């Protein structure tokens, strides 16, 4: 019986089974729910993307300078530093043979001096890139 009322409403088993609007902060997204579920609050590192509505639950982004990590944005990881690439659930430290210098930069392979006819003056690392140059010709 209490089933016929749509999303955004519930039926209380007090107040004789009737359908009523949801409490000020709450949502019901489906069917004959006996209760309006609590809206997610986005605070701290979280910023509210979609505000709380009776039909749809709220969604949380993170603070500028951060990024979401996890399924429903369960965590917030600080934007990774040089020599780091976001691994989609975790931030690896670059990769062996590659480099990234940037806040948000993606780790990219080193410059190849063999194709330019020169040789490595300074070998590369995670943070910096190979700088080529002539060999010890003197």
């Amino acid at each position: 019986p209490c089933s016929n009322c749509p999303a955004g409403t519930f039926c209380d088993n007090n107040r004789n089974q009737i359908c009523s609007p949801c409490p000020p902060n709450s949502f019901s997204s489906a069917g004959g729910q006996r209760t309006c579920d609590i809206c997610r609050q986005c605070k701290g590192v979280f910023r509210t993307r979609k505000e709380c509505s009776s039909t749809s639950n709220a969604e949380c982004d993170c603070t500028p300078g951060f990024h979401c990590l996890g399924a429903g944005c369960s965590m917030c990881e600080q934007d990774c530093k040089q020599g780091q690439e976001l691994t989609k659930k975790g931030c690896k430290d670059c990769c062996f043979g590659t480099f990234n210098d940037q806040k948000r930069g993606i780790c990219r392979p080193w410059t190849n001096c063999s194709l330019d006819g020169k040789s490595v003056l300074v070998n590369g690392t995670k943070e910096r890139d190979v700088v080529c140059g002539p060999s010890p010709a003197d």
Partner: protein
């Protein structure tokens, strides 16, 4: 009958009393006759005196990967009468293993007066007070009667 359950309204970690959702029709809250929640001082009132079983729930999640540690303490203070209920949850530090969750449960029989006001104060001592928040809907102060009537 006589019983109640309230879901904590608060999310972040800040010292001082906790707000609660008293409205039936919310997910996990139940409020029956003889018990009202005062939205001014954030303390629910038990009209009829007796012996009650009061249980405590605290669940915390790590919202920032790599930061946070310390302890988060919860205490249930009796207004008209120092700590009737004590639950101290520890937050693990960031390690190779991932522990993002911390939980605790406390309960015991309490004798409540007529018009006794009950409230929960949150006091947390942590390294980074951020990076750890209360899980929404998982923090609950329950009550149900024992003494017959």
């Amino acid at each position: 009958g006589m019983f109640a359950q309230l879901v904590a309204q608060n999310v972040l970690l800040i010292d001082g009393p906790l707000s609660w959702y008293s409205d039936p029709g919310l997910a996990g809250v139940s409020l029956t006759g003889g018990l009202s929640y005062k939205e001014d001082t954030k303390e629910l009132v038990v009209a009829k005196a007796g012996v009650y079983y009061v249980f405590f729930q605290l669940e915390l999640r790590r919202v920032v990967a790599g930061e946070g540690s310390g302890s988060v303490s919860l205490a249930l203070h009796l207004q008209p009468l120092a700590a009737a209920l004590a639950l101290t949850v520890d937050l693990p530090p960031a390690s190779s293993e991932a522990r993002n969750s911390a939980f605790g449960f406390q309960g015991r029989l309490l004798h409540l007066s007529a018009g006794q006001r009950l409230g929960v104060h949150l006091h947390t001592e942590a390294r980074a007070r951020h990076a750890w928040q209360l899980t929404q809907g998982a923090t609950v102060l329950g009550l149900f009667r024992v003494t017959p009537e």
